Amino acid sequence: ETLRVDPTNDRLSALVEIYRMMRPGEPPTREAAESLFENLFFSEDRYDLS
Amino acid sequence: APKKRWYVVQAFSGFEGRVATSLREHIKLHNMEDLFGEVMVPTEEVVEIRGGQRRKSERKFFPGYVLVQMVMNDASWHLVRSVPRVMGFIGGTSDRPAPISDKEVDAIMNRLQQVGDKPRPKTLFEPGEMVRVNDGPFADFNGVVEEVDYEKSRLKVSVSIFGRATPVELDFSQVEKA
Amino acid sequence: GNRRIRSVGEMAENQFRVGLVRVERAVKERLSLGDLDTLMPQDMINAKPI
DNA sequence: GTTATCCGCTCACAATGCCACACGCGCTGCTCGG
DNA sequence: CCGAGCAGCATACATTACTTGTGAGCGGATAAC
């Protein structure tokens, strides 16, 4: 059901979707969205699980 | 031939010059010495060489803003925005900037030329306003500016001397409030 | 089993790290703009924010 | 297709009275200053 | 050369943070002619 409602189809479309969601109104590039998602997690500094 | 149209960025209160320095440093980082060609922060100088504030003072055309000559590409967009302390762009809808038009460009250019050619004393006096005198010979007098002058800069001022009003040439440094 | 206590040392080091990351940003930008080898690591950082 | 219909989405907007006490209340690098 | 005032600065950022309970306007799905 989720994959049905899932509008996107590709990984880069996932990056741009999450990027727009995080802060609307910004020019979504590959590097911008990719670094944003790699900073939301997968970053020793911007994140830690204690 | 896509020319690098000028653009403007909103800085903080008093970091405009430092923001421009750091922006040139980010240019030298990303080697974008082509796209981010010119970056300018205009200013002015009021030269009142007496009465507290001494010998000069620096103003700005419009504070909080900085002027650049970038181009339009998302990479350069971030490179402008990925600098120490700037707010967003100043123009069209956010994420889609707009250029300061060439008419305004040459206008501000002429203003910059005029302020760069002639360092000129501002904070002038308007004809018909009362004012005290800080002159030696005429200490603690007060009269009305009967006629103002700029290049001669000597303030034709009427004041009560031997009864009836008389015009005097008390220079700027010998002029008190207003 | 899900509610843990947080003592004084833990919160103190938390606030310390918070006050430390901002001086980290400051010293990073000052190392960027500033000279590479002329300094002494005693003024690019300020004890004021800590 | 369109025109009206409806249902989930997001935001505004309320949270008892007193009393007492305590603590604090910008700043900061630019600007006026010698 | 540093001490004493100032002007407009979410400190530049990622700050940030579970349910609170209720009404009300609103935008995308929906039945009908």
Curated annotation (Swiss-Prot), chain C:
Signal peptide: none
Subunit structure: The RNAP catalytic core consists of 2 alpha, 1 beta, 1 beta' and 1 omega subunit. When a sigma factor is associated with the core the holoenzyme is formed, which can initiate transcription.
General function of this protein: DNA-dependent RNA polymerase catalyzes the transcription of DNA into RNA using the four ribonucleoside triphosphates as substrates.
Family: Belongs to the RNA polymerase beta chain family.
Protein name: DNA-directed RNA polymerase subunit beta
Portion of the parent chain present: 449 to 498 of 1342
